[PDB]
Ligand binder design. Structure first.
Ligand SMILES: Cc1cc2nc3c(=O)[nH]c(=O)nc-3n(C[C@H](O)[C@H](O)[C@H](O)COP(=O)(O)OP(=O)(O)OC[C@H]3O[C@@H](n4cnc5c(N)ncnc54)[C@H](O)[C@@H]3O)c2cc1C
Ligand SMILES: *[C@@H]1O[C@H](CO)[C@@H](O[C@@H]2O[C@H](CO)[C@@H](O)[C@H](O)[C@H]2NC(C)=O)[C@H](O)[C@H]1NC(C)=O
Ligand SMILES: *[C@@H]1O[C@H](CO)[C@@H](O[C@@H]2O[C@H](CO)[C@@H](O)[C@H](O)[C@H]2NC(C)=O)[C@H](O)[C@H]1NC(C)=O
Ligand SMILES: *[C@@H]1O[C@H](CO)[C@@H](O)[C@H](O)[C@H]1NC(C)=O
Ligand SMILES: *[C@@H]1O[C@H](CO)[C@@H](O)[C@H](O)[C@H]1NC(C)=O
Ligand SMILES: *[C@@H]1O[C@H](CO)[C@@H](O)[C@H](O)[C@H]1NC(C)=O
Ligand SMILES: OCc1ccccc1
Length: 509
C-alpha cells in the first residue's frame, strides 16, 4: 500500500444496533468486527449476505486512534464503558488492555506488521494452502501495510542489535526470520493509522451490513447446530439474527470475548456450567482453557539530550527471544498496561522503551465467567506468568542480550555519564541486575499484549476451525492457537480472516 488517509467508505453500510431489525436473517453472522472479523465478513460478502456485529462504536468518535501520535492517549484515557480501550487486571495482578471498537485491536495497537514464521504452518498440523496464504498476505498488504521511513532512534536500535550480535541484517522484509530487520507497519509514513476496518471497503456494499454497539449476549442452538444470535443495543432492546440454509455463525470476539460468549451460550466444561446455573448445550472441557500471554520484560533509559519519538519498526529476532524498542514523549498521566502497575515513576523527559518477548509461552491459565448472564461484565482471566521454568530461562537470555545492547557503541551517545558500565544510563523504573536475572523477570513482568488461546484448534475446534460437535459454527481469531505465529501476530490474523472466508466460499461452490 501507499500513503493515504483512513478510508471510511464502509460507513454507508454501518448502523447502530438500535436501528437494525428485531428479527434478522443473513447467510453468515460474524461476531466481533476485529482483526479477523473485519476481513472475514468482507470476504464472505463477495457472494453471500453477511451481518457483522460489534459491541464498540465507530473509530471517528475517538479521533486519537487514527494517528501514530495518539497511541498513548487511548491507553491514558479513562475506561467509562464506551471508550475504544477496555481496562482489565488479570488474576496475576498485571494491568492489561483490550479493544472495544470497530476494527478491533488494530485500531489501538502499536502497528507493527509481520508475516508468520514459516515453521508455524508445518507445526500446527493443519494442511495450509501456502499459495493462497501468500496471496491473502498480499491482499492485506496492498490495503493497509507500508514500508516505513528511516527513524533516528529505530535505526540506532537496529544498528545496536547487529553490534550486539543478532545476525544477519535482513534489510526490509515482512517475514519473521532470525536476525535484525526493518519490518512493515500499519501506520503509514504520514502517521495515519490503517487498520482492519478498512478491509470492510473491499467487500460488497449490497451484501454486508455492519452493526455497531451490538452487545452479543448469546449464541442460539437447535444433530446440534448453531441457528443464530441474541444481541442487545444502546437502548437495551434484545434483537435476534438467524442463518439461512448451509449458512454459518462465526465467532471472532477475541481471546477474551470468544470463550466468554461460548460459555454464556452453554458450550464448555459440564460441572463448571452447572455450578453457574447455565444450561449445557455442548460439553467441551477446553472452552476458556489454555489461555496464554507472552511476557514483556523491559528497561527505560532517559537520555541526557532529547530524542525523537518513533513507532516500533526495527526488530531483533532470535529463536529464544524477540526484541524491539519504542521511543516516546514524556507524560503526566500514565498509559494503562504499558507498565504492570499504576504505582510507577513518571518520565521527566523523552525516554526509550526497550523490550523483550518470551516465545510460546509454555505457561498457561484460563478465562472464567464473573457474571453468568451479562456479557458487558468482563470475564476473569489468569495467565500464570513464569509458572513454567523454561519461559524464565528464555527471559534470562533476552535480558542478557538487552544487556549486550546497552553495552553497544550505537547506544553509547545516550549515556548520562561517561562510565564503563551501563549505570552510565539514567533509568526510569528498575534497571538490569544468573539467579539475579530470575528475580528481575518475576517482579517486573508486563503484558506484551499478544495474548492468545481459549478456543484452540485441536481442543475446541477441528482443523477447519469448526467447533467440535456443533454444526454451522466456527471460531476465527487469536483464541485459536496456543503459540505465537511470530513476534507480532496481527498480520497472521488479518490474513486468517480472509483465508477461512475463502475456504468457506470454496466449500459452498
Ligand atoms: C496495546 C496493544 C498493542 C499491540 N501491538 C501490536 C503490534 O504492534 N503488532 C501486532 O502485530 N500486534 C500487536 N498487538 C496484538 C494484536 O493486535 C492482537 O493479539 C490481535 O489484534 C487480536 O485480534 P482478534 O481479532 O483476536 O481480537 P480483536 O481484534 O480485539 O477483535 C475482537 C472484537 O470483538 C469485539 N467483541 C468482543 N465480544 C463481543 C461481543 N460479545 N459482541 C460483539 N463484539 C464483541 C471486541 O470489542 C473487539 O473489537 C497489540 C495489542 C494491544 C492490546
Ligand atoms: C496526513 O495526516 C493527516 C493527519 O493524520 C490527515 O488529516 C486527516 O484528513 C482527514 C480527511 O482526509 C480528516 O477527516 C481528518 O480530520 C484529518 N486529521 C487530522 C488530525 O487533521 C491527512 O489525511 C493525511 N494525508 C495523507 C495523504 O495521508
Ligand atoms: C530523570 O529521572 C531519573 C530518575 O532516577 C534521574 O536519573 C538519575 O540521575 C542521577 C544523576 O543526576 C544518577 O546518579 C542516578 O543514578 C539516576 N537514576 C537512575 C535510576 O538511573 C534523572 O537525573 C532525571 N533527569 C533529570 C534531567 O534530572
Ligand atoms: C510464501 O511466502 C514466503 C515469503 O513470505 C516465500 O519464501 C515462499 O516461497 C512463498 N511460498 C509459496 C508457496 O508461494
Ligand atoms: C519458528 O518456529 C519454530 C517452531 O515451529 C521454532 O523452533 C523457531 O525458533 C521459530 N523461528 C524463530 C526465528 O523464532
Ligand atoms: C513446561 O512445559 C513443558 C511442555 O513441554 C512441560 O514438559 C513441563 O511440565 C513444564 N515445566 C514446568 C517446570 O512447569
Ligand atoms: O511491540 C512494540 C511495542 C512494545 C512495547 C511497547 C510499545 C510497542
Amino acid at each position: 500500500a501507499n500513503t493515504s488517509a483512513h478510508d471510511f467508505s464502509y460507513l454507508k453500510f454501518v448502523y447502530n444496533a438500535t436501528d437494525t431489525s428485531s428479527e434478522g436473517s443473513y447467510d453468515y453472522i460474524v461476531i466481533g468486527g476485529g482483526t479477523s472479523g473485519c476481513p472475514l465478513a468482507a470476504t464472505l460478502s463477495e457472494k453471500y449476505k453477511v451481518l457483522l456485529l460489534e459491541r464498540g462504536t465507530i473509530a471517528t468518535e475517538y479521533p486519537n486512534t487514527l494517528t501514530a501520535d495518539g497511541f498513548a492517549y487511548n491507553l491514558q484515557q479513562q475506561d467509562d464503558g464506551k471508550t475504544p480501550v477496555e481496562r482489565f487486571v488479570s488474576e496475576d495482578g498485571i494491568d492489561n488492555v483490550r479493544a472495544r471498537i470497530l476494527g478491533g485491536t488494530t485500531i489501538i495497537n502499536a502497528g507493527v506488521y509481520a508475516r508468520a514464521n514459516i515453521s508455524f504452518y508445518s507445526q500446527t498440523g493443519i494442511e495450509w494452502d501456502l499459495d493462497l496464504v501468500n496471496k491473502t498476505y498480499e491482499w492485506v498488504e496492498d490495503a493497509i501495510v507500508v514500508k516505513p521511513n528511516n527513524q533516528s532512534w529505530q535505526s540506532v536500535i537496529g544498528e545496536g542489535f547487529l553490534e550486539a550480535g543478532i545476525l544477519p541484517d535482513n534489510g526490509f522484509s515482512l517475514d519473521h526470520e532470525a536476525g535484525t530487520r526493518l519490518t512493515g507497519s500499519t501506520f503509514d509514513n504520514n502517521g495515519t493509522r490503517h487498520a482492519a476496518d478498512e478491509l470492510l471497503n473491499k467487500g460488497d456494499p449490497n451484501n454486508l451490513l455492519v452493526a455497531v454497539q451490538a452487545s452479543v449476549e448469546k449464541i442460539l442452538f437447535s444433530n446440534l447446530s448453531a441457528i443464530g444470535v441474541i444481541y442487545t443495543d444502546s437502548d437495551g432492546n434484545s434483537h435476534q439474527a438467524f442463518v439461512r440454509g448451509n449458512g454459518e455463525v462465526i465467532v471472532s470476539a477475541g481471546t477474551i470475548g470468544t470463550p466468554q460468549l461460548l460459555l454464556l451460550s452453554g458450550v464448555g466444561p459440564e460441572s463448571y456450567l452447572s455450578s453457574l446455573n447455565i444450561t449445557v448445550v455442548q460439553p467441551n472441557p477446553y472452552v476458556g482453557q489454555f489461555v496464554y500471554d507472552n511476557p514483556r520484560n523491559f528497561i527505560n533509559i532517559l537520555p541526557p539530550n532529547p530524542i525523537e519519538a518513533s513507532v516500533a519498526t526495527v526488530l531483533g529476532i532470535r529463536s529464544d527471544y524477540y526484541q524491539v524498542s519504542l521511543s516516546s514523549l514524556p507524560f503526566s498521566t500514565p498509559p494503562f498496561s504499558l507498565f504492570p502497575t499504576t504505582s510507577y515513576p513518571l518520565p521527566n523527559s523523552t525516554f526509550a522503551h526497550i523490550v523483550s518477548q518470551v516465545p510460546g509461552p509454555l505457561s498457561h491459565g484460563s478465562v472464567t465467567l464473573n457474571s453468568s448472564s451479562d456479557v458487558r461484565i468482563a470475564p476473569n482471566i489468569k495467565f500464570n506468568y513464569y509458572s513454567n521454568s523454561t519461559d524464565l530461562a528464555n527471559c534470562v537470555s533476552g535480558m542478557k542480550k538487552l544487556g549486550d545492547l546497552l553495552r553497544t557503541k550505537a547506544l553509547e551517545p545516550y549515556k548520562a555519564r561517561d562510565v564503563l558500565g551501563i549505570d552510565g544510563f539514567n533509568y526510569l523504573g528498575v534497571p538490569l541486575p544468573d539467579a539475579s536475572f530470575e528475580t528481575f523477570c518475576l517482579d517486573n513482568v508486563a503484558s506484551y499484549w499478544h495474548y492468545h488461546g481459549g478456543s484452540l484448534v485441536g481442543k475446541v475446534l477441528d482443523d477447519s476451525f469448526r467447533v467440535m460437535g456443533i454444526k454451522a459454527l466456527r471460531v476465527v481469531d487469536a483464541s485459536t492457537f496456543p503459540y505465537e505465529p511470530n513476534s507480532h501476530p496481527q498480520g497472521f490474523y488479518l490474513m486468517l480472516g480472509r483465508y477461512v472466508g475463502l475456504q468457506i466460499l470454496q466449500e459452498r461452490s
